[PDB]
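Hi L.,

As promised, Cellulose-binding GDSL lipase/acylhydrolase:
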Amino acid sequence: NPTYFFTFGDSYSQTGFSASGTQPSASNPMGNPDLGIGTTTNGPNWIGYLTTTENASLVLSYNLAAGGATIDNALVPAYPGDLASQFRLFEDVYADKPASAPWSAEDAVFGVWIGINDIGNAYYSTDAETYTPKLISRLESLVEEVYKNGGRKFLFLNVPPTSRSPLFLEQGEEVVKQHAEYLSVYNENLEGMVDDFTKKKGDVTTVLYDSWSFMTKILDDPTAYGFPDATCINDDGTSCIWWDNYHPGMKYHLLQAEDMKPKLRKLGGW
C-alpha cells in the first residue's frame, strides 16, 4: 500500500522526472531518472532521501519540480515550468487517478517547496507586506486544484535562508539583509495560509516544515554538522553546505530529510 508523493518546486527539489519516462513502482520508487541523478546536490536530494532512505513504508515519487521555478509567471516570472505549469502537468497526467498512479485521499501526499525564486527575483522591487500575499494567494489557489481532485495530505516547506548562499553573500550584507527581511514576510504569510487552509477545510492533514530554521542552525554552527564553514562551495555535495553558489549539497539534503522524517509521520509514509 504505497504513498503517492507528488512534489512541486524548483531546483532545490528537481530530479528531472519526466511524466513520459519510467513511472514509479515498488521496485523503482523514483520512476526516473535513477535515484541520485538530476539534482542540484551531486546525489539524492531531500525527495530522493525521503522516498528511499527515510521512508517507513513504500513511497512512490512523482517529482514535478522544475529548475528556476517561480509560483506563477503572471506574478514573478522566470522559466516556463513555473509552479502553475507543474500543477497543470499534474492535472493533465495524474489528477484523475490513472491506473499507473491510482491514488486516493488516504494515501497521496502533495509536497510543495516554492518561493526561493519568487523572493530571489522580487525582493528589491516589490513591497513584501502587500506583494507576498499575492504570491501566497496564488499558491493557495493551485493547492485548491489538488484539493478539488481529492487530495487531502499536504507538505509545505518554507523558504530556507538563501540570503546566506554565496550568491547573495557576494552582493553585500545590506542585500543579504534586504532579501532576508522580505523572505521572513513571505514565510510568515505562508504559515498563515497553511494554518487558514487547514482550519477552513477541516479534513486535511498538513505539515509546514520550517526549512528556514533548520538550515539556519547549520549555517550558524556548521562544524557541529561536519561542515568546515558555512560559505565554502564543493560540487562533491558533501565537503561543504553548498554544491554551487545557490544550492546545498546532498549532505545538507540528507540532514534535512532526516530532520523532516519525524515531522512527516502524520502524512503516512514516514
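The chain has eight helices and five strands.

Thanks again for sending the construct details.

K.
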